[PDB]
């Protein structure tokens, strides 16, 4: 890659600079180069990788939704024919989004996940794998939409199994995994009851474990519990 000649430490340093400059494409390229050095990632480095690509794909998903909405309006009764442009441009953004998701999934598969032995790293990467298959599922329509959905489910499920065995119920990675898996159930899998049940059980079991936490860990956990509560308020 284009980052093969830069030191690992310099790539990490520049990824942090790019975050401060809100240059998330750069940040993602720097962290991709850091991953491709072949060494495992620290807790902080995993967060940098995640933050970079979440911002990049977040912009693409927002644009895809704008364009998909315009496209759907143009294909309604009484709509004037505007030509292939809206579809073409939505396809362009969609293709770029799928390329980013494939890049992240390729990093996880080569070889972040297979070298991740600790629960903190393994659950983190498997949650990522579920997230980026979920983003692929959001735009999928063809022969493989069901397989993409099952790939997301399978990664989330393995992460859930490990987190329930190896992490306390207030662990922020465990909480964010359950939050996103519940969003998967609601938005992707057409299982709103499973989404609500998971969010409720996750919230209640975290609530009962808060007494064990320091002030700073309490703040971390209750922040994500509020996101679970926000979704439950929207879903019920």
């Amino acid at each position: 890659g284009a980052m093969g000649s830069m030191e690992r430490a310099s790539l990490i340093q520049k990824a942090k600079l790019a975050e401060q400059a809100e240059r998330y494409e750069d940040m993602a390229a720097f962290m991709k180069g850091a991953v491709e050095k072949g060494e495992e990632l620290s807790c902080e480095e995993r967060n940098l990788l995640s933050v970079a690509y979440k911002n990049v794909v977040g912009g693409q998903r927002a644009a895809w939704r704008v364009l998909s909405s315009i496209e759907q309006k143009s294909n309604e009764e009484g709509s004037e024919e505007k030509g292939p442009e809206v579809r073409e441009y939505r396809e362009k953004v969609e293709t770029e989004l799928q390329g980013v998701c494939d890049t992240v999934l390729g990093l996880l598969d080569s070889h972040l996940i297979k070298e991740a032995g600790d629960a903190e790293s393994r659950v983190f990467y498997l949650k990522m794998k579920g997230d980026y298959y979920r983003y692929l599922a959001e735009v999928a329509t063809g022969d493989d939409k069901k397989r993409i959905i099952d790939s997301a489910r399978s990664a989330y499920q393995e992460a859930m199994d490990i987190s329930k065995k190896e992490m306390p119920p207030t662990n922020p990675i465990r909480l964010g995994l359950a939050l996103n898996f519940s969003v998967f159930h609601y938005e992707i899998a057409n299982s709103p009851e499973e989404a609500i049940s998971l969010a409720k059980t996750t919230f209640d079991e975290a609530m009962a474990d808060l007494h064990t936490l320091s002030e700073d860990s309490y703040k971390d956990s209750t922040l994500i519990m509020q996101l679970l509560r926000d979704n439950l308020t929207l879903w019920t």
Partner: peptide, 9 residues
């Protein structure tokens, strides 16, 4: 429905 925002380290 909100997933983890996860856009700030």
């Amino acid at each position: 429905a909100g997933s983890i925002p996860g856009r700030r380290s």
